[PDB]
């Protein structure tokens, strides 16, 4: 029962696509476009990617 309440600075979880099994924070959110702006710490660098609410889980 994942929550759809996400806010800037909130950590999220990715379980779909190559970013699956990775966590990150949502710097920007887009309820109108139904997309969350969260980056994944890959290679030691943040990777700001857009994931859907179901594509990622609230942390």
């Amino acid at each position: 029962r994942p929550k759809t309440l996400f806010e800037p600075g909130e950590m999220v979880r990715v379980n779909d696509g190559p970013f699956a099994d990775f966590n990150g924070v949502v710097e920007e959110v887009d309820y109108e476009k139904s997309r969350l702006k969260v980056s994944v710490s890959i290679f030691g660098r943040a990777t700001p990617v857009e994931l859907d609410f179901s594509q990622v889980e609230k942390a």
């Binding site: 696509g17 190559p18 890959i42 290679f43 990777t47 990617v49 857009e50």
Partner: protein, 80 residues
């Protein structure tokens, strides 16, 4: 109908062109297609490249994850 969009930045043009080549090779060996890469004008001594991967497969995504990108190159990546 999804695309992987990648933007690269680096202060060292040698690193950015090597990373770009590595991404292209990984995509193509993957059964995916490449659009670009293109260079943008250098801004604040920062080199910039854009490249997209169309018709990505699971093998493409996995190959990109495995790829070790050099220190000193920033890669922003999205899928949609």
């Amino acid at each position: 109908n999804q695309r992987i969009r990648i933007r690269l930045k680096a202060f060292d043009h040698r690193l950015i062109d090597q990373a770009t080549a590595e991404i292209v090779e990984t995509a193509k060996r993957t059964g995916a297609q490449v659009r670009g890469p293109i260079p943008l004008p250098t801004r604040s001594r920062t080199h910039l490249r854009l490249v997209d991967i169309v018709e990505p497969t699971e093998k493409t995504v996995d190959a990109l994850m495995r790829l070790d990108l050099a220190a000193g190159v920033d890669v922003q990546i999205s899928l949609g």
